[PDB]
Write a protein that binds this ligand. Structure first.
Ligand SMILES: [Mg+2]
Ligand SMILES: [Mg+2]
Ligand SMILES: [Mg+2]
Ligand SMILES: [Mg+2]
Ligand SMILES: [Mg+2]
Ligand SMILES: [Mg+2]
Ligand SMILES: [Mg+2]
Ligand SMILES: [Mg+2]
Ligand SMILES: [Mg+2]
Ligand SMILES: [Mg+2]
Ligand SMILES: [Mg+2]
Ligand SMILES: [Mg+2]
Ligand SMILES: [Mg+2]
Ligand SMILES: [Mg+2]
Ligand SMILES: [Mg+2]
Ligand SMILES: [Mg+2]
Ligand SMILES: [Mg+2]
Ligand SMILES: [Mg+2]
Ligand SMILES: [Mg+2]
Ligand SMILES: [Mg+2]
Ligand SMILES: [Mg+2]
Ligand SMILES: [Mg+2]
Ligand SMILES: [Mg+2]
Ligand SMILES: [Mg+2]
Lengths: 305, 99, 116, 72, 158, 326
RNA sequence: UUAAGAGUUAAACCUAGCCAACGAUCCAUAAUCGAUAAUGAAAGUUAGAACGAUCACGUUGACUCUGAAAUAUAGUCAAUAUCUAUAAGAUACAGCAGUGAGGAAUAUUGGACAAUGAUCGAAAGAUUGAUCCAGUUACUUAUUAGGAUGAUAUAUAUAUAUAUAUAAAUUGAUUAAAAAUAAAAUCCAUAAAUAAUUAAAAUAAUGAUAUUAAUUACCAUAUAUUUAUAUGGAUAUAUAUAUAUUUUAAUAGUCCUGACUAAUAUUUGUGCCAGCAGUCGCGGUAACACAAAGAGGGCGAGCGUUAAUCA
RNA sequence: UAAGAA
């Protein structure tokens, strides 16, 4: 069974009563107004909890279920408010007990309906500079930096590149005041990555799950045989799962052509083998088909492969 | 570079008259300048109002003159007097009967 | 060109986007018919070079893939290259200046260099 | 129910239902016949296309105009 | 296009690669010994038996395989000018350069093909005798008595 | 692509990839997707409806069905909570440049990210890319023009008329405060200190205050009332005619009226509910650069595909798109 | 006879065989296939348009010459049908355009040989309806086809929950009944245009496409490695030089909402009529199904429908 | 990598 269901709020709100013939209003609009609170002469909603950004590295994600859909607060004292019968905003008659003891995992959960979405941890500029110095100056391998700071290796390399770009931009005075204010207000919104904590440091033993293993296979053997990861790897015809981590932690003859004055291009001839080189004859044409191959040029132009 | 006018081809008018292919009517679009004949490219000629075949022929003959090759008029091939091969038998049948 | 066996270019790709197979073909078969052998590929469009890289001084690259040992075999048994293929093979070092023509005949800024 | 016998260009003579509120089909009219039976008329296994040939589209049609040969 | 799965998912075809040497050569002792071996009889026999007479106009034996002598093939296909030289003219020089290049390429191709065939035979013999050892090592390593085999019930006497 | 139409309808209540205020309320009032009392088709349809409203709404149904992958990618940890495999139903959209920009928070929406790409403001490891469908591979660095990012993340720049009216109101309130302070400084000091006591130290003003005299009220100066009718159309005039302790020599929100955002840059309103740091990108906000580390994966207890819907909704949507809605 | 086997074709002699219910002979129908297309979990099934491979034919039939190879789009004879030149004549568009017909239905009487080939030539070059481009056509597939903000308009009066009043307020409705952040307005863009250049397809030279793509929003140069500040040619101004340095948007249909099957905000007309319908079925005064308004659900430069294929 | 419905 299914009907159209206007997405009314799941929490109580005061609905319209008798309306002046010319109001022309909807209950959804009133629900939004109550959620937002009064709008300033400046076009601002100071009374709404979520109007302003946090500043203490504790994200201010929505909690419509814990707080019963009461999103209003005093902007200066931050104390909860409620809409009284007379159309004013005052203290709640009773205090909420679900808004003080909030599980620390819930504070990093952007969406109330998805427990598996959590925000990442921002790295402090000091840690990023430390990693950049370690990788570039002291020449420490990315594996041991990853282990020391508990960061996945691609993230470490990305940090190195991003810090290099930042260094260039700072040497050129391209980081304007607006950019610095934006960066620092964004940085104070998210939790800060802590190298020392065990539960805040990234797991460093992850490997992709290939299709080959995903199928469950079972072996019946004598009751006392040992059967370890290496035997399992042999059975599935794969490298053992430890060499996968080990390998993830880490000729053709060519002839360049004679250029002469006035010639606008050079020829390089790469050696190939007959029966493997060429455009095949009677190959599948997909240009009129839904999976036609689209690629991008070295200049970023969309081309048809 | 711009080559030297020769005694065989003193003026641009002489060049046009020698290459032929009814480019004699194209003497006006040039200002009779050796530099104009030997510096104008295909796009300039297209702007000036030269048709495709004429400008391609002129560029070919200008190149020949640059590399010291004769610029005598090559004539575009024509059909036989008795029509083309596919219509030759019919034409000759009608021609011999009528004469 | 002459002879029954000829090394020439067979057109592939879309309209306004030519690519070519370097092929050994019977002289009578169609240009895009299945040949005796596909010796390689040829992309006539040079690889784009950035303007800063033009300041550096790189030359745009025209890409040619080729089976050199088999191409020399086909030249040996008498196959006749076309004009464009003749140009391609002369600049690859397979053919020497004896295959040049009067029109095609100059200071060398770079020298044909073989790498591994 | 409004129907008509129609002789097709392939020579077969069929019975075709005429959909829509009102029709202007008459003897010797040129029509176009598609598949689709009229369920409550036995023997009529084809439909005439409104808005094609000499059969005009339904007059003052608002909804489903394309099914009845009506312009916007 | 699921047939392409049978060919590495490659759509379209190439012309089949021509063989530079169209018959086995003389420097290939394996094929020579194989053809020159006794011919079997019985259920897998190849030819006519001792007392059986073949059809009147037919040949009892398959045609004689004619092995290639690459030295002779080069000698006849591309022989160098027996005259010392002429060395005049311009087109004559162009033709001389072209002819020597063509000849050089053709000897190179023929001899490299010879070498590749013989090298392939050597490699295949080594591969066979390396597999024949790896397989035996594996079968024997599945013969080392495992202690856990004491838990598999046995009735060897019966 | 689809023409944006009623993307923020409160009655429909679909959640979009956007920092919009109406989108924020739609997300807030939602609750969960109600799957009870529904046939399997109705469940799958509801799931598809909601999840496609969020993930890649601007893609046509047929294009999305073409780019949909039954393959779901996950990582096994070799050193327990259940891996939410089917939150990867829409992971393939995350390698698109327009989604990468939105996850990097370089655009207020995927739609705005598309426009930023199409107008030439985006680069992928050096080369300008003008095609939103462009797909990033691991390790690719992309960047956005900093003004575009600052405008996406910043507050709207007011027009002259609106800012001038706001500043008129500023003058009136400042003068009212000055009068109240001058007449009765006792009660004003009392209220000021009481409010300082009430407020939390989170405000910077409290920290600065931690860091009676009748002379105080003598420093407060009235501000002349402005009438905009005569002042209309002349920005250099109104700029010098406004002088307040907080905003000095500029009309409200237009400190430098040649940049594309609220010029004394402050974050856009309602930014914190959507401020989510992705796990598959590294973001440098000073340079407005980012690196695409990997395709999002699911691990025990977590999925890196950011979504406002629970595992059952994505399961039902995945069932829908496996069979083309059969 | 043939280069060559064979009742292959011709001649002679013999023997009485050969095929066939695991389907002969006969009849009908059909070009065949793929590393091609569709579909499906797959086995498979379908197509054989496109790309490629093979065969056959060039109005119909037989024969002959030449040739390595031809019953050749050749020649001879005949048939059919047209033209005149009225002859032991020519032509046969299944080459490219194009016309008429048939049909539900399938386009230019286009440009260039610039590229890749092919023919002739010693070469210079000539020819090429191959080919390459363009035209027509939503036939198919892509990409774009605008983002952010946005529920009022007037008045009066180093702080900040601004507060008072007067106007108005479209359709539906009297609250979980909405249309609707939708409009309008606001901010910021880009496309197009406008100018400057301008590669690449091709080089020894040649560019049909072509009012090319791409780039720059005055032009260069001179250093840094795209963002910069400088030196010099522009630039009207006011009075060489402080200044600025093109303009600039927004355009969706079509089907459906009783169940199968997504569509709850309800109303009006008709009254077993008119009609609807893929299946069950709906319509007899209270129609969620007919015809419509409001609202709503799909897909979207398409949507529906018919014909078909696969599942 | 095999779903059914009236
Ligand atoms: Mg329903
Ligand atoms: Mg002549
Ligand atoms: Mg020749
Ligand atoms: Mg209808
Ligand atoms: Mg015989
Ligand atoms: Mg006989
Ligand atoms: Mg039979
Ligand atoms: Mg037939
Ligand atoms: Mg068939
Ligand atoms: Mg075909
Ligand atoms: Mg065809
Ligand atoms: Mg024939
Ligand atoms: Mg005909
Ligand atoms: Mg015939
Ligand atoms: Mg024709
Ligand atoms: Mg007709
Ligand atoms: Mg040509
Ligand atoms: Mg022509
Ligand atoms: Mg009303
Ligand atoms: Mg009624
Ligand atoms: Mg119905
Ligand atoms: Mg109806
Ligand atoms: Mg309506
Ligand atoms: Mg489309």
């Amino acid at each position: 069974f299914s009907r159209r269901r206007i997405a009314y709020p799941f929490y109580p709100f005061k609905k319209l009563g008798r309306q002046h013939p010319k109001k022309h209003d909807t209950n959804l609009k009133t629900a939004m107004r109550q959620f937002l609170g009064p709008k300033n002469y400046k076009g601002e909603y100071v009374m709404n909890k979520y109007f302003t950004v946090p500043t203490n590295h504790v994200p201010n994600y929505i909690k419509p279920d814990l707080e019963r859909g009461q999103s209003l607060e005093h902007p200066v004292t931050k104390k909860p408010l409620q809409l009284r019968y007379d159309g004013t905003l005052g203290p709640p008659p009773v205090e909420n007990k679900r808004l003080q003891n909030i599980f620390k995992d819930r504070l990093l959960q952007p969406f109330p309906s998805n427990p598996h979405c959590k925000t990442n941890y921002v790295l402090s500029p000091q840690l990023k500079q430390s990693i950049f110095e370690e990788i570039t100056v002291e020449g420490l391998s990315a594996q041991q930096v990853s282990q020391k700071y508990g960061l996945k290796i691609p993230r470490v390399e990305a940090i190195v590149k991003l810090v290099s770009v930042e260094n260039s931009w700072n040497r050129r005075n391209r980081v304007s005041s607006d950019l610095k204010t934006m960066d620092e207000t964004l940085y104070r919104m998210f939790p800060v990555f802590d190298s020392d904590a065990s539960f805040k440091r990234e797991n460093l033993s992850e490997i992709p799950v290939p299709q080959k293993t995903l199928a469950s296979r079972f072996l019946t053997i004598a009751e006392s045989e040992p059967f370890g990861p290496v035997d399992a790897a042999h059975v599935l015809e794969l490298e053992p799962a430890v060499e996968t981590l080990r390998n993830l932690s880490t000729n053709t003859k060519v002839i360049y052509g004679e250029l002469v004055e006035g010639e606008r291009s050079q020829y390089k001839f790469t050696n190939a083998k007959v029966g493997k080189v060429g455009y095949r004859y009677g190959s599948g044409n997909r240009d009129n088909k839904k999976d036609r191959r689209i690629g991008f040029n070295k200049l970023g132009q969309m081309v048809y492969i | 570079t711009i080559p030297k006018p020769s005694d065989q081809v003193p003026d641009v008018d002489a060049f046009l008259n020698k290459i032929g292919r009814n480019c004699n009517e194209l003497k006006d679009t040039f200002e009779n300048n050796w530099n104009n004949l030997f510096q104008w490219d295909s796009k300039i000629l297209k702007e000036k109002g030269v048709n495709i075949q004429q400008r391609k022929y002129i560029l070919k003959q200008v190149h020949n003159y640059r590399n010291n090759r004769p610029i005598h008029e090559i004539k575009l091939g024509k059909k036989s007097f008795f029509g083309g091969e596919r219509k030759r038998k019919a034409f000759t049948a009608k021609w011999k009967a009528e004469n | 060109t002459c002879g029954l066996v000829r090394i020439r270019l067979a057109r592939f790709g879309r309209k306004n986007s030519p690519v070519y197979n370097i092929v050994v073909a019977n002289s009578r078969k169609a240009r895009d018919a299945k040949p005796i052998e596909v010796l390689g590929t040829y992309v006539p469009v040079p690889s784009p070079v950035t303007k800063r890289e033009l300041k550096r001084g790189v030359v745009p690259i025209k890409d040619v893939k080729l089976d050199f040992d088999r191409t020399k075999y086909w030249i040996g048994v008498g196959a006749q290259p076309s004009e464009t293929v003749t140009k391609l093979l002369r600049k690859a070092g397979i053919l020497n200046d004896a295959w040049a023509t009067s029109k095609n005949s100059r200071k060398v800024v770079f020298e044909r260099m073989e790498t591994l | 129910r409004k129907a008509c016998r129609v002789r097709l260009t392939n020579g077969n003579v069929v019975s075709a239902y005429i959909p829509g509120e009102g029709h202007d089909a008459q003897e010797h009219s040129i029509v176009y016949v598609r598949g689709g039976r009229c369920q409550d008329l036995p023997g009529v296994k084809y439909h005439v296309i409104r808005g094609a040939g000499d059969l005009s589209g339904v007059v003052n049609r608002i909804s489903s105009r394309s099914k009845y040969g009506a312009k916007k | 296009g699921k047939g392409a799965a049978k060919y590495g998912f490659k759509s379209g075809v190439f012309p089949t690669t021509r063989s530079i040497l169209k018959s086995p050569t003389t420097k290939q002792t394996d094929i020579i010994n194989k053809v020159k071996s006794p011919k079997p009889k019985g259920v897998l026999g190849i030819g006519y038996a001792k007392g059986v007479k073949h059809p009147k106009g037919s040949h009892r034996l398959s045609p004689k395989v004619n092995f290639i002598d690459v030295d002779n093939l080069i000698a006849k296909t591309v022989a160098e000018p027996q005259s010392i030289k002429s060395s005049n003219g311009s087109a004559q020089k162009v033709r001389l350069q072209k002819a020597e290049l063509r000849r050089k390429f053709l000897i190179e191709a023929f001899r490299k093909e010879e070498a590749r065939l013989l090298h392939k035979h050597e490699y295949l013999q080594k591969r066979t005798k390396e597999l024949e050892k790896a397989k035996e090592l594996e079968l024997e390593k599945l013969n080392k008595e495992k202690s856990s085999d004491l838990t598999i019930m046995t009735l060897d006497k019966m | 692509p689809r023409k944006a139409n009623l993307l923020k309808s409160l009655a429909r209540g679909r959640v979009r990839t956007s920092f919009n205020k109406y989108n924020l309320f739609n997300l807030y009032k939602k609750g969960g997707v109600d799957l009870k009392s529904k046939s399997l088709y109705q469940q799958k349809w509801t799931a598809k409806q909601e999840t496609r409203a969020y993930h890649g709404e601007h893609l046509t149904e047929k294009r999305w069905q073409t780019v949909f992958k039954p393959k779901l990618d996950s990582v096994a940890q070799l050193d327990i909570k259940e891996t939410p495999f089917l939150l990867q139903t829409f992971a393939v959209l995350e390698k698109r440049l327009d989604f990468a920009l939105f996850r990097a928070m370089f655009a207020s929406s995927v739609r705005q990210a598309r426009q930023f790409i199409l107008h030439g403001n985006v680069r992928v490891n050096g080369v300008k890319i003008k095609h939103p469908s462009y797909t990033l591979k691991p390790g690719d660095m992309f960047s956005v023009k900093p003004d575009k990012v600052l405008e996406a993340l910043g507050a709207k720049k007011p027009s002259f008329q609106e800012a001038l009216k706001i500043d008129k109101t500023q003058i009136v309130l400042w003068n009212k405060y000055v009068k109240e302070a001058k007449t009765e400084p006792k009660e004003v000091w009392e209220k000021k200190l009481e409010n300082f006591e009430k407020m939390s130290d989170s405000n910077p003003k409290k920290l600065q205050f931690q860091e009676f005299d009748p002379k105080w009220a003598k420093n407060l100066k009235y501000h002349d009332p402005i009438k905009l009718s005569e002042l209309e159309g002349d920005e250099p005039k109104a700029r010098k005619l406004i002088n307040l302790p907080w905003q000095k020599n500029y009309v409200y929100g237009r400190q430098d009226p040649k940049k594309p955002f609220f010029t004394p840059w402050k974050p856009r309103p309602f930014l914190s509910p959507f401020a989510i740091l992705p796990h598959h990108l590294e973001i440098s906000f000073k340079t407005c650069h980012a690196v695409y580390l990997r395709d999002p994966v699911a691990r025990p207890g977590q999925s890196e595909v950011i979504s406002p819907f629970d595992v059952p909704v994505h399961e039902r949507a995945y069932m829908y798109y496996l069979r083309n809605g059969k």
